[PDB]
Design an enzyme around this catalytic site. Sequence first.
Site: not given
Ligand SMILES: *[C@@H](O)[C@H](C[C@@H]1CCNC1=O)NC(=O)[C@H](CC1CCCCC1)NC(=O)OCc1ccccc1
Length: 174
Positions: A32, A56, A132
């Site tokens: 992503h 991913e 990420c």
């Molecule tokens: C990197 O892009 C982030 C890292 C996250 C953000 C918050 N703490 C972390 O370690 N990853 C994401 O935001 C995830 C993205 C998704 C992953 C699966 C595939 C599609 C995209 N989302 C995620 O971690 O959501 C959980 C969340 C955590 C904290 C606040 C809101 C939501």
Amino acid sequence: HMAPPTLWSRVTKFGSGWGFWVSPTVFITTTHVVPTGVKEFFGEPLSSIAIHQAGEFTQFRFSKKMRPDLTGMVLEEGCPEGTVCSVLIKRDSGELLPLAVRMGAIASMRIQGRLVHGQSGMLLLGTIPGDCGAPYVHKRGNDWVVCGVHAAATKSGNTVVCAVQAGEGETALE
Ligand SMILES: *[C@@H](O)[C@H](C[C@@H]1CCNC1=O)NC(=O)[C@H](CC1CCCCC1)NC(=O)OCc1ccccc1
């Protein structure tokens, strides 16, 4: 165990996050964060790159040596349950934030609406938006191994998830 400077030098800003040079030609990242709407990565046209995306987990194999200064290192599909890894987080400021994580089960987990093949772990001062693609590494003897790229966390931050290469086997939940 403390990751040495060369290992950190493999962590590279990419898209909305980071990726990791496994060898001179192989770069891994989290799907992503990969830019869309581009015709090239690191100046190389897409048709000159072998792009493998499994959920991913994204791997690029370039046609030319992009990091000829590096040796190859081992990429594995996750690690055994209980392994303590280091997540090599670089922040946009340049700060290094290696985070210790005790790794758990490999599974396909529903995260933000989609099924993600990955490994969860407990952070042992956490991950944030922008992190990420950071690699999950651990030391094996004298050498470091990479086994995942940062993908997600819980809202509390105490559980993290790295995406891992595709593959089923008897130690993963299926
Ligand atoms: C990197 O892009 C982030 C890292 C996250 C953000 C918050 N703490 C972390 O370690 N990853 C994401 O935001 C995830 C993205 C998704 C992953 C699966 C595939 C599609 C995209 N989302 C995620 O971690 O959501 C959980 C969340 C955590 C904290 C606040 C809101 C939501």
